Amino acid sequence: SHMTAVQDFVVDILLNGARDWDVLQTTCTVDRKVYKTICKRGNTYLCFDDTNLYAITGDVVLKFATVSKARAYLETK
């Protein structure tokens, strides 16, 4: 598994559409790394890598321990 949980999560924004977030296909740059956003709400950009998700709040990378964490983030701030 890898493109399993991450995948299925990402399309819930990508085709199916988020919560109150804009559905943005851009990639963000933080931590001297680039992360792929799915969706933007305000100053926040929810992004994923090979492993898990991160919220980038402006310049603030916030690694989730899961993919499903970012789903419950999308309804919570």
UniProtKB/Swiss-Prot annotation:
Domain spans labelled DPUP: 4-76
Subcellular location: Host membrane; Host cytoplasm
Membrane topology: Multi-pass membrane protein
Catalytic activity line of the entry: Thiol-dependent hydrolysis of ester, thioester, amide, peptide and isopeptide bonds formed by the C-terminal Gly of ubiquitin (a 76-residue protein attached to proteins as an intracellular targeting signal)
Function text: Responsible for the cleavages located at the N-terminus of the replicase polyprotein. In addition, PL-PRO possesses a deubiquitinating/deISGylating activity and processes both 'Lys-48'- and 'Lys-63'-linked polyubiquitin chains from cellular substrates. Participates together with nsp4 in the assembly of virally-induced cytoplasmic double-membrane vesicles necessary for viral replication. Antagonizes innate immune induction of type I interferon by blocking the phosphorylation, dimerization and subsequent nuclear translocation of host IRF3. Also prevents host NF-kappa-B signaling.
Protein name, entry field: Papain-like proteinase nsp3
Organism this protein belongs to: Bat coronavirus HKU9 (BtCoV)
Gene name tied to this protein: rep
Residues of the full protein shown: 1345 to 1418 of 6930
